[PDB]
């Protein structure tokens, strides 16, 4: 009768080597053949306990067989393991505003999945518990883009990859913020400034009137004020002070008509301009 | 604005410790809280890379959050990993014949499952490509016993475990052989032993007639001959020789009537007894 | 000609297994024999690169040989490695006061050294850079006790162990504090209290006089006041307040003579009693 | 009282990270400062056990200190470890003959030393039990070349490195064979070939006389015969047969005078030429 199948009782992967221990018929030949045509053979020690280390072969595939001194073969023991942990990332083309920060205004961002072994057949993406199938593109790259817009907020996202044997590895999570929201800001003459004949006609006797900038979101990275006088527009950086965001022209204006607006941009590259405000300076 | 969520870029488990590296807002507090209510806090270095090691918590469960110098808190990063590789084995109580060779005559053997974490939600046993769900006994031990007898043959078996979070680990396989089959053997007088008048009457004039033992399966581990004389049965060990299995009485037989059968036992502990053979010694 | 010696080009120890890779004559038999009589043999693959894992044998000792298909042996390659990191600790018998804290008043504390493999032949102890030979006692335990008293202070201590092959491992450090110092404390009548006919005769008209406890070191764990009146002594726990350490008897004393002292104990179990103070209460 | 010194109870290096566990005053700040000026701070958990991972710093150098909520600082715990295992190898420039077999005719071979950390203060080469100190060339590469020729034989060699702190690592050994020896070979006319009148005159009547090649060391890898005729030398490859090494001219020789010698080269690249043999063909 041929020897009984060898038994693998321990395995570990340490630095691209598979380390194994098991049992097999004392004195027989243990034959390990990998997916790459490599063969490693050893003599099972007298107590029938063996140990071995082999380089990790393509797709984690190898088979172990016992052969006795007279050429009889055991049942083979096919093994198919997996070692690579998959990675998921926000595509740079779906990463708006500042690049690299995992914040974007793309409500249907594309995710790219990497570090997959060549026998991976199933790739799924978990978005806050909802699981979706990933797609493989023309270049053989796995990716996922939501079919409907994601609402604004912060999403915990990971990828799960399995091979044909059903080995499954789960990525580290990433945290992606969808931010497609920015309040339209507003510019107005500050409290004392709309004076003279009225508190609401936007006609002021101040040649250097002070403006309040309101509805400026906390995640704003840039605040500018646009001033158009006689068909010519100049842009100024807003002041952020103890009083909030304000604008005062850096020199006195001639009497005349000024159209102002304020523009805000946030981290995701959202951009809004205020309704315009038509002011008249009248100091004489 | 609160700080952005911290990022874990690397993890590994080395002797009961989870080792992590990541990024986070420079100078912020990174707070790690595990399922056991432990809290590990660290200050993120100026270059924004952090590293840490924590004891593996119950169920692989912990969350990481960033808090700034003003007490504003980031979105949390929940982790739920699994480290234990499950083990499956043939129950000693289902391992017939030679012990510990994964060969049994039990057609519904019990497999014992071990090394599972408390948050496991799927325990599956793959038998030659078909998965069945494992069961838990009243003591809390996971096992699988097939509901219907297995056919004789070779069975590659593994167990797969998954937690609630979806992490999955696959055992090393075992190879179990079901062997409930054993050919009924045959005892006869060997060539030249059924002598005297007729070659077919089973009357011999030899006082130590040689018998041939036939139809002995290759996995037989024990061969005995049962000799009944004067109503009483004696058991003898057969001898395997250059001509195969035979039996010659160890001392001379008296004239009279004998009844013989051979019994074989295979490595799985199956046993078969031949038809009986009535011989007369007439010397 | 016999095969050339096999070459080991990689080794690592992972969980009681020695993992090895190297080169040797293609198709030859590689024979690994350990210190415990164990033999592990394998066939060198066709490219002449081999890998193996063996249980760590006694004293990290094994030899590797090549044998060709016709029985000729190479030069052997003897290996002798070491895996255990030595440990040093303060002996519990040299650990005064609170046990377990590495603080002691023993200026010649004994250190115990452990986790040494059986082939270790040299054991040295490094105390803030000064290196000393350890000794082995009757039970075969390595230890070190300083020959002269160590001055008070904090010492960074480690152990270095080597085997016969000259492999050397260095322990983690320990930090041991020698504290054999405690100021003798003093008890005195507080500012207003030595009154009546004099500010320095220790005769007071206060029936519940207040005492100051001075020269109490910061590392004191216990402060008590001893009061002897008519040959009978009672002990009280001192008060630590906004004013420091003080004592006031919890009820009025009869007129008469009181002898007081204060006793301090520190973490190392150092213990000092003040000079006694003879006070007289006279309220009539 | 400042807090007591923190304690490191466990360390290990796993892919460029130092992994540590220890104890320290509960709720205190543990500050780790490395040789590169990085600082990693953590809050010690309520149960007083801390764990951490840091990138391996230049020279394995870092210190750990405890600071309490009031800014009092413990005694520091300086660590200085070493992770790199040194490597030694035979310089290709000193590896004669067959390349990469650690066998050479160079009696003062150069060994190249690699994988040393910047704080190394001892670099030693052990040759069959005697240590010599290694040298550093002007480019900064450590090496050892013996000052006096090595005798022929087998040399087990390893390198040992130590830092200023006293940490020591030992390389895997190499086995180098010095072989500068090769027996001078011999060419003669084989049995029956020195024929005709005298068996000793080296006049043959064979136009393709067979020659025996003798005193060929077992480690010979190349055997050639130099045939000089009419003042010009031709080189032939000898043939190793069932009778050993021989040479028969590949085509018939004209009557006249020939001069022969055999040249052997061994695996180490040593070469020897035999004495010349003058033969006359007279057919
Ligand atoms: Ca695979
Ligand atoms: Ca972005
Ligand atoms: Ca926004
Ligand atoms: Ca107005
Ligand atoms: Ca889990
Ligand atoms: Ca069995
Ligand atoms: Ca099937
Ligand atoms: Ca059977
Ligand atoms: Ca008959
Ligand atoms: Ca050793
Ligand atoms: Ca103590
Ligand atoms: Ca003290
Ligand atoms: Ca007085
Ligand atoms: Ca160092
Ligand atoms: Ca060479
Ligand atoms: Ca020597
Ligand atoms: Ca030679
Ligand atoms: Ca002649």
TrEMBL record, chains A, C:
Ca(2+) 1 binds at residues 59, 80-81, 119, 163. Transmembrane segments: none annotated. Ca(2+) 5 binds at residues 194-195, 198, 201, 203. Ca(2+) 4 binds at residues 179, 181, 219, 266. Ca(2+) 2 binds at residues 95-96, 98, 101, 103. Ca(2+) 3 binds at residue 128. This is Inner membrane protein. It comes from Salmonella typhimurium (strain LT2 / SGSC1412 / ATCC 700720).
């Amino acid at each position: 009768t041929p020897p009984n199948a060898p038994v693998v009782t321990y395995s570990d992967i340490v630095n691209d080597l598979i380390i194994m221990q098991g049992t097999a018929e004392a004195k027989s030949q243990l034959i390990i053949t990998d997916s790459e045509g490599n063969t490693y053979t050893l003599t099972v020690p007298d107590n029938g306990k063996w140990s071995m280390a082999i380089p990790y072969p393509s797709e984690g595939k190898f088979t172990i067989t016992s052969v006795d001194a007279i050429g009889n073969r055991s049942d083979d023991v096919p093994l198919d393991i997996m070692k690579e942990v998959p990675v998921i990332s926000l595509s740079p083309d779906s990463d708006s505003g500042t690049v690299g920060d995992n914040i974007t205004r793309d409500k249907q961002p594309t995710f790219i999945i990497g570090n997959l072994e060549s026998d991976v057949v199933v790739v799924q993406v978990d978005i806050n518990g909802t699981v979706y199938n990933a797609e493989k593109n023309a270049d053989g790259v796995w990716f996922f883009t939501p079919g409907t817009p994601l609402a604004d907020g912060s999403y915990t996202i990971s990828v799960i990859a399995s091979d044909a044997a059903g080995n499954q590895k789960n990525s580290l999570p990433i945290t992606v913020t969808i931010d497609s929201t920015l309040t339209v800001p507003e510019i107005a003459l500050a409290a004392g400034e709309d004076n003279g004949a009225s508190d609401s006609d936007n006609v002021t006797n101040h040649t250097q009137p002070k403006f309040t900038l309101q509805h400026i979101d906390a995640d704003v990275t840039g605040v500018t004020v646009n001033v158009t006088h006689n068909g010519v527009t100049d842009i100024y950086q807003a002041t952020q002070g103890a009083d909030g965001w304000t604008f005062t022209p850096p020199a006195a204006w001639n009497d005349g008509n000024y159209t102002l607006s304020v523009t805000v941009v946030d981290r995701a590259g959202n951009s809004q301009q205020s309704a315009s405000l038509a002011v008249t300076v009248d100091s004489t």
